[PDB]
Amino acid sequence: YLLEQYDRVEAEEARLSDLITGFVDPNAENSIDPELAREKFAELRAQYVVTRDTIKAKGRSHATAQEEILKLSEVFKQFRLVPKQFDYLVNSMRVMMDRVRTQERLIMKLCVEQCKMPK
Amino acid sequence: MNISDVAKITGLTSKAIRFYEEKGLVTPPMRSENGYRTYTQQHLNELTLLRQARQVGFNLEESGELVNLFNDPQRHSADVKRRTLEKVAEIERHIEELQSMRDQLLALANACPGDDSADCPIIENLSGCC
Amino acid sequence: MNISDVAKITGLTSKAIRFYEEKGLVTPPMRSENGYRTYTQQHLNELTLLRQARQVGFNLEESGELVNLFNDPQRHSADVKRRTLEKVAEIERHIEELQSMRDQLLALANACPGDDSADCPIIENLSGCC
Ligand SMILES: [Cu+2]
Ligand SMILES: [Cu+2]
């Protein structure tokens, strides 16, 4: 996720070019200096490290675990979308689903054509 | 940074900067995705150093070594000044021998009548005939 | 005369000689059964003069024109004389340039401690820090 891409671009100590200009960038409702980004990219890390622990808190769908889900979301919903790089983040779903989906189809290709089955 | 703004700040032009980067004479500036060479205050002062280095007389190579000096915060003012002084000496030799040449030219020319003649004594002093 | 002949007599090397030839500085020599350039005293004189255009410091072009004047006896001693004067003017330019900026190198020497300090102020004035 965006924290990963922001460290990958910060892998070699430096960048202020366009690919950061897409990133988090809260508009006060545009080159980005280090300290501002390092701050905006930090309380998100805090929401993660305090969020990923409650996923197991008596289930994926626990009250306060969903509170940290919805709160991480609300933490993001003040912010805006991030650049065409984020395209691959969506692809990382499709290329999974494209595969997963396909396997179901494949299983059906193995289950549904030769023998009879109910529908 | 904006590459034209940088080249005007240092007085150079972009292909000059690019020539110097081709010769590995500064810190590498990144590009942007569009391809704009990401210069810096680091590249600002590297380029100003590399600028005045040759106006002083340091070639592409030794001026690259000067940007090495700057990029070396471990640097030693001694060797810097020793090379400054070796340069002084080479300029001295240059001056001396250029003026020896000058003196020979002047001995040739004042020896000439300049009498719009076929009898140009200079050239026949220069040519190995007669 | 083969190229070794005028080369080892006047003293120039085969590369510089054929370079001067294809440059058109010098007369196209006669040629052989095999196209080897059988030079003559013409070319020997031309090439001694062409050197003493070089060693004197004329560029290749003005040097070619020196040798063209020589075998063109309608030349004027005055023209060669003013040429030498203009060349010595350029020598005065080159030498006073070196003198001035070397005086400034000496000022640089005066400024630096040269004491193995990574606060070498030379790098600090060139690299426009602060
Ligand atoms: Cu004359
Ligand atoms: Cu010093």
GROMACS .gro file of C-alpha atoms and ligand atoms in nm:
model
  381
    1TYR     CA    1   0.000   0.000   0.000
    2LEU     CA    2   0.088   0.372  -0.035
    3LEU     CA    3   0.324   0.351   0.263
    4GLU     CA    4   0.514   0.081   0.075
    5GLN     CA    5   0.531   0.282  -0.249
    6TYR     CA    6   0.637   0.589  -0.048
    7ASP     CA    7   0.926   0.396   0.109
    8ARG     CA    8   1.016   0.238  -0.228
    9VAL     CA    9   1.048   0.585  -0.378
   10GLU     CA   10   1.227   0.692  -0.058
   11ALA     CA   11   1.453   0.387  -0.093
   12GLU     CA   12   1.743   0.593  -0.236
   13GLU     CA   13   1.721   0.882   0.015
   14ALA     CA   14   1.546   1.133  -0.214
   15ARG     CA   15   1.259   1.241  -0.439
   16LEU     CA   16   1.025   1.542  -0.460
   17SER     CA   17   0.910   1.485  -0.821
   18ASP     CA   18   0.561   1.412  -0.951
   19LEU     CA   19   0.504   1.065  -0.805
   20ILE     CA   20   0.489   1.216  -0.456
   21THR     CA   21   0.258   1.489  -0.590
   22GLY     CA   22  -0.005   1.219  -0.635
   23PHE     CA   23   0.042   1.084  -0.284
   24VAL     CA   24  -0.152   1.158   0.033
   25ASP     CA   25  -0.136   1.540   0.016
   26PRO     CA   26  -0.422   1.667   0.233
   27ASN     CA   27  -0.578   1.962   0.055
   28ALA     CA   28  -0.655   2.254   0.287
   29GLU     CA   29  -1.032   2.224   0.245
   30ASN     CA   30   0.284   2.121  -0.535
   31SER     CA   31   0.626   1.984  -0.441
   32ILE     CA   32   0.632   1.802  -0.107
   33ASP     CA   33   0.907   1.856   0.147
   34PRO     CA   34   1.040   1.568   0.361
   35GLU     CA   35   0.908   1.649   0.710
   36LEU     CA   36   0.546   1.709   0.606
   37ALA     CA   37   0.533   1.378   0.419
   38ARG     CA   38   0.716   1.190   0.696
   39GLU     CA   39   0.445   1.318   0.931
   40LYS     CA   40   0.146   1.244   0.705
   41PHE     CA   41   0.295   0.899   0.631
   42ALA     CA   42   0.332   0.827   1.007
   43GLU     CA   43  -0.006   0.837   1.182
   44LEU     CA   44  -0.124   0.603   0.906
   45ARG     CA   45   0.148   0.363   1.026
   46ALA     CA   46   0.009   0.419   1.376
   47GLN     CA   47  -0.343   0.329   1.260
   48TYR     CA   48  -0.205   0.015   1.096
   49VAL     CA   49   0.003  -0.106   1.390
   50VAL     CA   50  -0.295  -0.040   1.622
   51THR     CA   51  -0.537  -0.188   1.362
   52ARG     CA   52  -0.370  -0.510   1.243
   53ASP     CA   53  -0.371  -0.649   1.599
   54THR     CA   54  -0.750  -0.634   1.645
   55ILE     CA   55  -0.824  -0.825   1.322
   56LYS     CA   56  -0.782  -1.138   1.535
   57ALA     CA   57  -0.964  -0.987   1.835
   58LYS     CA   58  -1.235  -1.254   1.846
   59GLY     CA   59  -1.279  -1.241   1.467
   60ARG     CA   60  -1.222  -1.046   1.147
   61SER     CA   61  -1.552  -0.865   1.213
   62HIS     CA   62  -1.528  -0.764   1.579
   63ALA     CA   63  -1.691  -0.445   1.709
   64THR     CA   64  -1.371  -0.260   1.798
   65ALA     CA   65  -1.179  -0.429   1.518
   66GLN     CA   66  -1.442  -0.286   1.284
   67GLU     CA   67  -1.400   0.036   1.480
   68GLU     CA   68  -1.034   0.038   1.377
   69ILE     CA   69  -1.134  -0.053   1.021
   70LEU     CA   70  -1.385   0.232   1.003
   71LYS     CA   71  -1.142   0.461   1.188
   72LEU     CA   72  -0.853   0.386   0.950
   73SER     CA   73  -1.101   0.458   0.673
   74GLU     CA   74  -1.209   0.789   0.832
   75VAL     CA   75  -0.838   0.867   0.876
   76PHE     CA   76  -0.808   0.825   0.500
   77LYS     CA   77  -1.134   0.995   0.399
   78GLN     CA   78  -1.002   1.339   0.488
   79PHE     CA   79  -0.729   1.264   0.231
   80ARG     CA   80  -0.763   1.227  -0.147
   81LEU     CA   81  -0.689   0.960  -0.408
   82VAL     CA   82  -0.332   0.885  -0.512
   83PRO     CA   83  -0.180   0.858  -0.859
   84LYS     CA   84  -0.203   0.622  -1.157
   85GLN     CA   85   0.058   0.418  -0.969
   86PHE     CA   86  -0.241   0.313  -0.760
   87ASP     CA   87  -0.363   0.138  -1.078
   88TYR     CA   88  -0.142  -0.158  -0.990
   89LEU     CA   89  -0.289  -0.169  -0.640
   90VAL     CA   90  -0.619  -0.238  -0.814
   91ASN     CA   91  -0.443  -0.481  -1.047
   92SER     CA   92  -0.314  -0.667  -0.741
   93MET     CA   93  -0.680  -0.740  -0.673
   94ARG     CA   94  -0.781  -0.823  -1.031
   95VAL     CA   95  -0.481  -1.044  -1.102
   96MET     CA   96  -0.572  -1.231  -0.784
   97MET     CA   97  -0.943  -1.243  -0.863
   98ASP     CA   98  -0.877  -1.311  -1.233
   99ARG     CA   99  -0.688  -1.613  -1.103
  100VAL     CA  100  -0.925  -1.708  -0.818
  101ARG     CA  101  -1.236  -1.655  -1.032
  102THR     CA  102  -1.067  -1.854  -1.309
  103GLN     CA  103  -0.997  -2.148  -1.078
  104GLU     CA  104  -1.366  -2.163  -0.987
  105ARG     CA  105  -1.447  -2.160  -1.358
  106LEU     CA  106  -1.173  -2.418  -1.409
  107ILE     CA  107  -1.317  -2.635  -1.131
  108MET     CA  108  -1.653  -2.598  -1.300
  109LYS     CA  109  -1.488  -2.683  -1.633
  110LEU     CA  110  -1.382  -3.000  -1.452
  111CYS     CA  111  -1.705  -3.049  -1.256
  112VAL     CA  112  -1.983  -2.930  -1.485
  113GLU     CA  113  -1.915  -3.055  -1.841
  114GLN     CA  114  -1.848  -3.428  -1.802
  115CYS     CA  115  -2.095  -3.540  -1.534
  116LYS     CA  116  -2.438  -3.412  -1.433
  117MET     CA  117  -2.471  -3.182  -1.133
  118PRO     CA  118  -2.756  -2.984  -0.978
  119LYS     CA  119  -2.775  -2.609  -1.016
  120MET     CA  120   1.467   2.118  -1.019
  121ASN     CA  121   1.364   2.295  -1.334
  122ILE     CA  122   1.654   2.234  -1.564
  123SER     CA  123   1.649   2.569  -1.741
  124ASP     CA  124   1.615   2.758  -1.412
  125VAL     CA  125   1.916   2.567  -1.288
  126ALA     CA  126   2.124   2.631  -1.599
  127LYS     CA  127   2.049   3.004  -1.583
  128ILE     CA  128   2.131   3.007  -1.211
  129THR     CA  129   2.469   2.854  -1.293
  130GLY     CA  130   2.489   3.045  -1.624
  131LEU     CA  131   2.541   2.727  -1.828
  132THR     CA  132   2.293   2.560  -2.059
  133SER     CA  133   2.135   2.219  -2.035
  134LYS     CA  134   2.362   2.039  -2.281
  135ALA     CA  135   2.660   2.173  -2.087
  136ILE     CA  136   2.523   2.017  -1.770
  137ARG     CA  137   2.448   1.701  -1.963
  138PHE     CA  138   2.799   1.691  -2.106
  139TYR     CA  139   2.935   1.719  -1.755
  140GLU     CA  140   2.708   1.444  -1.629
  141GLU     CA  141   2.817   1.230  -1.924
  142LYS     CA  142   3.170   1.286  -1.799
  143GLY     CA  143   3.056   1.185  -1.449
  144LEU     CA  144   3.150   1.523  -1.309
  145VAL     CA  145   2.877   1.572  -1.044
  146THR     CA  146   2.636   1.388  -0.819
  147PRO     CA  147   2.377   1.212  -1.038
  148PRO     CA  148   2.054   1.411  -1.056
  149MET     CA  149   1.750   1.190  -1.090
  150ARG     CA  150   1.492   1.232  -1.360
  151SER     CA  151   1.121   1.266  -1.310
  152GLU     CA  152   0.885   1.021  -1.481
  153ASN     CA  153   0.840   1.275  -1.760
  154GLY     CA  154   1.221   1.280  -1.771
  155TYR     CA  155   1.317   1.614  -1.617
  156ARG     CA  156   1.662   1.602  -1.463
  157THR     CA  157   1.606   1.646  -1.089
  158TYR     CA  158   1.877   1.893  -0.991
  159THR     CA  159   1.931   2.017  -0.636
  160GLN     CA  160   2.107   2.265  -0.414
  161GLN     CA  161   2.369   1.992  -0.405
  162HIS     CA  162   2.379   2.007  -0.783
  163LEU     CA  163   2.357   2.387  -0.759
  164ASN     CA  164   2.685   2.412  -0.571
  165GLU     CA  165   2.846   2.119  -0.755
  166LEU     CA  166   2.778   2.297  -1.082
  167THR     CA  167   2.897   2.635  -0.957
  168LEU     CA  168   3.218   2.469  -0.834
  169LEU     CA  169   3.258   2.288  -1.169
  170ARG     CA  170   3.179   2.618  -1.342
  171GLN     CA  171   3.450   2.832  -1.189
  172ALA     CA  172   3.696   2.540  -1.183
  173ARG     CA  173   3.777   2.571  -1.555
  174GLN     CA  174   3.748   2.949  -1.567
  175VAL     CA  175   4.026   2.913  -1.314
  176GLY     CA  176   4.182   2.643  -1.535
  177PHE     CA  177   4.084   2.303  -1.398
  178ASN     CA  178   3.990   2.073  -1.680
  179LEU     CA  179   3.699   1.834  -1.698
  180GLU     CA  180   3.899   1.579  -1.500
  181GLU     CA  181   4.054   1.783  -1.220
  182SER     CA  182   3.733   1.982  -1.184
  183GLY     CA  183   3.549   1.653  -1.143
  184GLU     CA  184   3.806   1.585  -0.874
  185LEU     CA  185   3.714   1.920  -0.715
  186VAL     CA  186   3.351   1.819  -0.700
  187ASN     CA  187   3.487   1.501  -0.543
  188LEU     CA  188   3.660   1.727  -0.290
  189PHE     CA  189   3.334   1.904  -0.210
  190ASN     CA  190   3.142   1.576  -0.193
  191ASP     CA  191   3.424   1.466   0.040
  192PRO     CA  192   3.349   1.637   0.374
  193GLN     CA  193   3.665   1.452   0.485
  194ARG     CA  194   3.861   1.674   0.248
  195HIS     CA  195   4.209   1.808   0.315
  196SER     CA  196   4.272   2.176   0.241
  197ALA     CA  197   4.640   2.091   0.190
  198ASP     CA  198   4.612   1.885  -0.129
  199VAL     CA  199   4.358   2.137  -0.257
  200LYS     CA  200   4.604   2.421  -0.217
  201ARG     CA  201   4.893   2.210  -0.349
  202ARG     CA  202   4.699   2.157  -0.671
  203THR     CA  203   4.609   2.525  -0.677
  204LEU     CA  204   4.981   2.593  -0.668
  205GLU     CA  205   5.074   2.331  -0.926
  206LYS     CA  206   4.824   2.513  -1.145
  207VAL     CA  207   4.996   2.843  -1.067
  208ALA     CA  208   5.322   2.683  -1.181
  209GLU     CA  209   5.178   2.545  -1.504
  210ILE     CA  210   5.028   2.885  -1.583
  211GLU     CA  211   5.370   3.034  -1.514
  212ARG     CA  212   5.539   2.803  -1.764
  213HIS     CA  213   5.262   2.886  -2.010
  214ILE     CA  214   5.319   3.260  -1.964
  215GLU     CA  215   5.697   3.231  -1.992
  216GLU     CA  216   5.701   3.025  -2.310
  217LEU     CA  217   5.419   3.222  -2.475
  218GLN     CA  218   5.623   3.536  -2.417
  219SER     CA  219   5.934   3.370  -2.556
  220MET     CA  220   5.726   3.301  -2.867
  221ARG     CA  221   5.601   3.661  -2.860
  222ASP     CA  222   5.956   3.788  -2.847
  223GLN     CA  223   6.053   3.575  -3.145
  224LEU     CA  224   5.753   3.704  -3.343
  225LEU     CA  225   5.845   4.061  -3.257
  226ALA     CA  226   6.207   4.010  -3.359
  227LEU     CA  227   6.073   3.878  -3.690
  228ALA     CA  228   5.823   4.157  -3.750
  229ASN     CA  229   6.024   4.463  -3.647
  230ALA     CA  230   6.305   4.319  -3.858
  231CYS     CA  231   6.061   4.342  -4.152
  232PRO     CA  232   6.055   4.662  -4.364
  233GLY     CA  233   5.686   4.625  -4.437
  234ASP     CA  234   5.775   4.785  -4.768
  235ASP     CA  235   5.489   4.605  -4.951
  236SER     CA  236   5.765   4.408  -5.118
  237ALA     CA  237   5.825   4.068  -5.264
  238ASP     CA  238   6.122   4.108  -5.028
  239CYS     CA  239   5.926   3.991  -4.725
  240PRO     CA  240   6.220   3.894  -4.498
  241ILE     CA  241   5.991   3.724  -4.244
  242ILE     CA  242   5.873   3.437  -4.466
  243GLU     CA  243   6.221   3.364  -4.599
  244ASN     CA  244   6.339   3.353  -4.238
  245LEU     CA  245   6.056   3.104  -4.184
  246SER     CA  246   6.118   2.897  -4.499
  247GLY     CA  247   6.419   2.668  -4.539
  248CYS     CA  248   6.545   2.771  -4.884
  249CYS     CA  249   6.832   2.967  -5.038
  250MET     CA  250   6.082   1.222  -5.287
  251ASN     CA  251   5.865   0.983  -5.084
  252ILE     CA  252   5.693   1.106  -4.770
  253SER     CA  253   5.984   0.984  -4.557
  254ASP     CA  254   6.212   1.211  -4.754
  255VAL     CA  255   6.050   1.547  -4.687
  256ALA     CA  256   5.927   1.414  -4.351
  257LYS     CA  257   6.273   1.334  -4.216
  258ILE     CA  258   6.423   1.639  -4.387
  259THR     CA  259   6.185   1.916  -4.281
  260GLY     CA  260   6.100   1.705  -3.974
  261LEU     CA  261   5.723   1.649  -3.976
  262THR     CA  262   5.540   1.315  -3.939
  263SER     CA  263   5.346   1.134  -4.210
  264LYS     CA  264   5.006   1.180  -4.043
  265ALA     CA  265   5.049   1.553  -3.988
  266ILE     CA  266   5.189   1.579  -4.341
  267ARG     CA  267   4.903   1.409  -4.524
  268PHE     CA  268   4.669   1.599  -4.293
  269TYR     CA  269   4.828   1.923  -4.412
  270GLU     CA  270   4.796   1.790  -4.766
  271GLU     CA  271   4.428   1.695  -4.767
  272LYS     CA  272   4.381   2.022  -4.583
  273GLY     CA  273   4.495   2.182  -4.909
  274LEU     CA  274   4.764   2.381  -4.731
  275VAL     CA  275   5.027   2.253  -4.970
  276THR     CA  276   5.047   2.184  -5.342
  277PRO     CA  277   4.907   1.850  -5.459
  278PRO     CA  278   5.234   1.669  -5.534
  279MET     CA  279   5.305   1.457  -5.836
  280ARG     CA  280   5.213   1.090  -5.823
  281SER     CA  281   5.364   0.763  -5.920
  282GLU     CA  282   5.317   0.435  -6.098
  283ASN     CA  283   5.160   0.351  -5.762
  284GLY     CA  284   5.035   0.693  -5.656
  285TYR     CA  285   5.310   0.750  -5.401
  286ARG     CA  286   5.369   1.123  -5.361
  287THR     CA  287   5.711   1.187  -5.514
  288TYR     CA  288   5.769   1.522  -5.343
  289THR     CA  289   6.013   1.793  -5.456
  290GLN     CA  290   6.205   2.090  -5.321
  291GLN     CA  291   5.877   2.277  -5.369
  292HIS     CA  292   5.715   2.072  -5.098
  293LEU     CA  293   6.022   2.076  -4.873
  294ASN     CA  294   6.026   2.456  -4.871
  295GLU     CA  295   5.648   2.467  -4.830
  296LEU     CA  296   5.671   2.237  -4.529
  297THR     CA  297   5.960   2.408  -4.353
  298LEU     CA  298   5.759   2.730  -4.382
  299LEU     CA  299   5.442   2.552  -4.273
  300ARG     CA  300   5.613   2.435  -3.955
  301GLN     CA  301   5.752   2.779  -3.881
  302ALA     CA  302   5.396   2.897  -3.920
  303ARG     CA  303   5.299   2.632  -3.661
  304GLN     CA  304   5.591   2.660  -3.420
  305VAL     CA  305   5.548   3.037  -3.438
  306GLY     CA  306   5.186   2.964  -3.344
  307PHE     CA  307   4.971   3.032  -3.650
  308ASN     CA  308   4.665   2.816  -3.684
  309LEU     CA  309   4.657   2.569  -3.970
  310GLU     CA  310   4.464   2.805  -4.198
  311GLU     CA  311   4.673   3.120  -4.160
  312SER     CA  312   4.974   2.890  -4.191
  313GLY     CA  313   4.849   2.756  -4.523
  314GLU     CA  314   4.811   3.118  -4.628
  315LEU     CA  315   5.171   3.187  -4.522
  316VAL     CA  316   5.291   2.912  -4.755
  317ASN     CA  317   5.057   3.039  -5.027
  318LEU     CA  318   5.208   3.387  -4.997
  319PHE     CA  319   5.562   3.249  -5.011
  320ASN     CA  320   5.534   3.090  -5.353
  321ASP     CA  321   5.309   3.382  -5.456
  322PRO     CA  322   5.581   3.649  -5.493
  323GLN     CA  323   5.323   3.924  -5.542
  324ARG     CA  324   5.293   3.905  -5.162
  325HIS     CA  325   5.362   4.222  -4.964
  326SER     CA  326   5.611   4.237  -4.677
  327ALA     CA  327   5.374   4.482  -4.507
  328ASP     CA  328   5.088   4.229  -4.505
  329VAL     CA  329   5.296   3.962  -4.333
  330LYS     CA  330   5.426   4.229  -4.095
  331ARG     CA  331   5.077   4.339  -3.984
  332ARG     CA  332   4.978   3.974  -3.957
  333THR     CA  333   5.261   3.908  -3.715
  334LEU     CA  334   5.162   4.220  -3.521
  335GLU     CA  335   4.801   4.106  -3.490
  336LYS     CA  336   4.919   3.763  -3.378
  337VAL     CA  337   5.141   3.925  -3.113
  338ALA     CA  338   4.838   4.127  -3.006
  339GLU     CA  339   4.661   3.796  -2.945
  340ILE     CA  340   4.968   3.675  -2.756
  341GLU     CA  341   4.943   3.982  -2.533
  342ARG     CA  342   4.582   3.885  -2.474
  343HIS     CA  343   4.672   3.529  -2.380
  344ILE     CA  344   4.960   3.625  -2.153
  345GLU     CA  345   4.784   3.908  -1.968
  346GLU     CA  346   4.487   3.676  -1.920
  347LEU     CA  347   4.715   3.416  -1.761
  348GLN     CA  348   4.889   3.686  -1.555
  349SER     CA  349   4.567   3.825  -1.411
  350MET     CA  350   4.398   3.499  -1.325
  351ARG     CA  351   4.725   3.357  -1.188
  352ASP     CA  352   4.754   3.660  -0.962
  353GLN     CA  353   4.411   3.560  -0.841
  354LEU     CA  354   4.527   3.199  -0.792
  355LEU     CA  355   4.799   3.346  -0.572
  356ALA     CA  356   4.530   3.531  -0.379
  357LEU     CA  357   4.355   3.196  -0.336
  358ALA     CA  358   4.677   3.054  -0.201
  359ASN     CA  359   4.692   3.352   0.034
  360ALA     CA  360   4.340   3.278   0.158
  361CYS     CA  361   4.355   2.904   0.230
  362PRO     CA  362   4.535   2.747   0.529
  363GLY     CA  363   4.617   2.440   0.322
  364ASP     CA  364   4.628   2.250   0.653
  365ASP     CA  365   4.434   1.929   0.579
  366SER     CA  366   4.114   2.101   0.688
  367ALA     CA  367   3.784   1.981   0.550
  368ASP     CA  368   3.693   2.347   0.603
  369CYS     CA  369   3.905   2.427   0.299
  370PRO     CA  370   3.758   2.772   0.218
  371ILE     CA  371   3.856   2.728  -0.150
  372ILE     CA  372   3.583   2.468  -0.206
  373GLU     CA  373   3.359   2.702  -0.004
  374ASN     CA  374   3.403   3.007  -0.231
  375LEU     CA  375   3.382   2.806  -0.553
  376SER     CA  376   3.090   2.591  -0.442
  377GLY     CA  377   2.877   2.892  -0.360
  378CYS     CA  378   2.804   2.797  -0.002
  379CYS     CA  379   2.653   3.066   0.220
  380CU      CU  380   5.845   4.112  -4.515
  381CU      CU  381   4.155   2.513   0.309
   0.00000   0.00000   0.00000
